Design a protein around this ligand. Sequence first.
Ligand SMILES: [Ca+2]
Ligand SMILES: [Ca+2]
Ligand SMILES: [Ca+2]
Ligand SMILES: [Ca+2]
Lengths: 289, 289, 289, 289
Amino acid sequence: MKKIILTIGCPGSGKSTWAREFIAKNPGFYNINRDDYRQSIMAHEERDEYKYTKKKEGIVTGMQFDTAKSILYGGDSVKGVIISDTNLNPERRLAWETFAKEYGWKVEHKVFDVPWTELVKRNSKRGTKAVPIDVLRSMYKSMREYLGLPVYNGTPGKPKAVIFDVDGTLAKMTDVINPMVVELSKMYALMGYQIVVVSGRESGTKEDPTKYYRMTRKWVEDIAGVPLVMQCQREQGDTRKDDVVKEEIFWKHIAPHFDVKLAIDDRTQVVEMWRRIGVECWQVASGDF
Amino acid sequence: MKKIILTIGCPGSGKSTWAREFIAKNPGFYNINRDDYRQSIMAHEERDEYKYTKKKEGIVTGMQFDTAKSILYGGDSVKGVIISDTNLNPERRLAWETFAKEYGWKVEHKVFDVPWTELVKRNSKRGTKAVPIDVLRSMYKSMREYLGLPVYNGTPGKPKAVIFDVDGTLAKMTDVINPMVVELSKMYALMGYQIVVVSGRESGTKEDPTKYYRMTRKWVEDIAGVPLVMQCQREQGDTRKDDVVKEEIFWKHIAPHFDVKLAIDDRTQVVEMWRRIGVECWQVASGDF
Amino acid sequence: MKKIILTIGCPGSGKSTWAREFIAKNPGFYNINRDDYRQSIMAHEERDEYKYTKKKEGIVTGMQFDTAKSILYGGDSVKGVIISDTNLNPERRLAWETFAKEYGWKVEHKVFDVPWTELVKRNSKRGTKAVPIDVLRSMYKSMREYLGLPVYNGTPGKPKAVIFDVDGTLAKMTDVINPMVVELSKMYALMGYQIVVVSGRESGTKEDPTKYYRMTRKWVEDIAGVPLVMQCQREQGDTRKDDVVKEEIFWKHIAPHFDVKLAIDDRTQVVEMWRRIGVECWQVASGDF
Amino acid sequence: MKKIILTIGCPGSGKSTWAREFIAKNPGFYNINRDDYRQSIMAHEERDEYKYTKKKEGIVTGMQFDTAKSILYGGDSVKGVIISDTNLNPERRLAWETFAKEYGWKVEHKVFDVPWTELVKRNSKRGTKAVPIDVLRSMYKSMREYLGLPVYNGTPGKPKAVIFDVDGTLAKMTDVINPMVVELSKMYALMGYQIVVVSGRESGTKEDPTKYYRMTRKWVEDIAGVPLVMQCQREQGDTRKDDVVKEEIFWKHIAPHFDVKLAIDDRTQVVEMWRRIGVECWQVASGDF
Ligand SMILES: [Ca+2]
Ligand SMILES: [Ca+2]
Ligand SMILES: [Ca+2]
Ligand SMILES: [Ca+2]
């Protein structure tokens, strides 16, 4: 049975580099792509900015299926076709499976799951064919939904709480307290909120695995006076992205003991994470690092 | 007297497009540029990512002055040279004036002041030679300092206050209140803070110039219950960027009656503005629109 | 009646620059193109070299008509479509007219006739999407056939003859004779051939309109000893390409009095011309100027 | 002693791809290049066509040595510099050795000898930064002079002769004779010239190593009636370029028994070869294959 391969990825994920790579080695497959159709029918030049239209889209979609059927109804040399689109919308993925249903073709998937941070890096350098930051975020959001990744919906029972970062949030860089924010934690203290403190600093070093955890705990507790309830920090020896560390700490140490209602941070890649998993977050300062 | 033209702009401002344009029409001038030297001495290809080095920089700087003196000490056909760099660091601008001092050349300036928002648009589409978002912000920050633009340092006397946006901040889009944030305004109400409300919505329409100001004032005051003290909104008929509107409203209506200690918003271009002028700001949600 | 515009041109003629230009101003038309389809179905990157296949072509053609019918059978907003291909093969042009026949659409033409020399200039600088020199020549050859331009088939009656250029052919640059070639003219003298001499040098200058014609005639006749029968040269004040001058001189002064059986030259652009119009030609030296 | 590496190659030879490759692995070296300086001082954009000037050149040269001395008189970390230019002019190569002489640096060479045919292939696809065909030929001509490759100056003693190709020269493609050319051989027969015939066709096949040599010899001798004196053809099993085959046959079988005064061919790559080695050649037809 001839196959129809759908690539599943956000722009910059690797879909195309793969499609060409593949097709080159597997003579028999052929590439079909929206971006290409979108540019060709406008005779656009690489540096042009395509304008969105419901009309042009229909056209483009039509061009896809028609070419699909048209290349899949050829010589017994045709192994199948690749749809190197983002394919992140489900109603669209379904559309393909149904279409391949009433013609006798199977549908396969080739995923290109790349970390948010890496997608952003490439996007910015995509240039013209780059994609706005707000659409990349949504894309990735749909990719998380396709992968099944979790979204925190709360925690019935346990007390509500606000999370605070240390570097750049409560502290400004033996640094000095960031007034307005430290006050915040103390105001959420009045209200009746539990205050969990968090930090991406390594707990300590090889020989003193808590050197920094201790130095931080001291600071927070004796210079900032943050009435915390629980403090968490990156374990010594962890070289994974801040992105990933704080999520893991949230799920394994926070989520199951608190009803998180807010998170305060400054680092963009972290703030971006809190919001994906379903946790409101306020960035207290420009943090593009 | 031969001249040495320094272009003053952030990347994407227009420096180079101008330099080539100019030189083409004014036979006699010659271009000198860091970026070019930085790429040539590494034999880099357009798509390569140059790595920063204090050593390589020295080299590059040396290449500049040497070529400067070398092209300015030529035939009486040489009108002068253009330094198409960002030239935003002052210690560097001075260096040129002193150098041109001890050789008999005058220093001229050609400014390319482009709105932040426009710089960001182009940067993202610059591709490889694009520049990280954090360095663009600093660049622009230096450009504001060179232009003399104001930076709010506070207001001795008048009462302290926090500013709140409406669309997407206090309200989520007859929309519904955004819980955590509306609570914030009320908590800053306890403390003893004056709460100024702000909005980029047009006050009203041609015939009803306050239709929206009224609809907003009602909402804020009777559904959100925000104990504001002053409400400001974009005057009907204003088609300038949100960026620009709220700054103007700040300087002409807020700054002179309040000691602003914080601003709450969600729209990135606005949050970016509050911080340039020296006003802490917390983004309560992803707002890349 | 909806229209289907076929652009007629060799690559580099201007087809695409026009299509985009047009479509931008005439909202309603849409671009369809082989090159685009050829690259998309291979997921090729700009710098890749497509490999020709009878199979892939069929595919591409199918993609054209299908999209043609598919975009021409849409909303009453669709004015028509543009086929920005070379469309130089007639069997192909016919195919379109017949197709548009059995659907109710008219076929229009938009020609982009550019001089050979200019096509070659652009081609070389086309880079990757450039086209081999032998295919450009054929293309252009088909364009001449579409324009109706003449092809010399001979001249029944008048005596046979060989044409010789002067600069770089009979003479090497008061220059000195090019031995082997001057001998040639004299050998074609034995055989029984009439020898017509030709030159792209201006006959003379403003005030002495024959200064060079005379200087040449002297040389040819008294240092080279070429037993010519007729000498022709570029009239003083003619700034048109050598290409064009010698063709005009051929048709208006040579073709009607001689049965040309060969032409000797060295300048590529001229040799290229002699052969298009149906005249054998031998290049006696590298002449890429 | 610090080194100054001169790359020796025609454009497209590989100089730059190598320089970047090298420098990346050998931290300590730095690239200096004319092309870069030539573009930077005009603020040209990739797609611009630089205009040659004796003035701008001086500038560029000055920029080289100055940067050379300037980067070679730095920290003990500087291993040396690479001059990724064509460096094909000798007066220029000398200039470097003398310069590095009066400063204490040694001069090294890194050659990039690529076949003519391959240089032409890449050039055409170089695009903007491509180089005219006439300058490539000269470049390569200088490269042959630097490599020491031979240039035939004649053969005192042995009889003079003209060489003729078969495919496309004497024959037009059991093909049919090309009238005007076959007549030529017979006319050079009168004069008193020896006629050597040559062919790039394989002599024969695996089992019949002369099948084609015989078929050709028959044709030439009994249908064209060419009064040859010696026939040479590509030995069965030789898959090297026509370019290379005929040169080898010339040096090992022709040059030492004849005083070649002309060669007739049609294939461009072959005609290009005859002329490099110092043998006049006439292309009888467009042969870009
Ligand atoms: Ca932080
Ligand atoms: Ca808002
Ligand atoms: Ca000539
Ligand atoms: Ca041949």
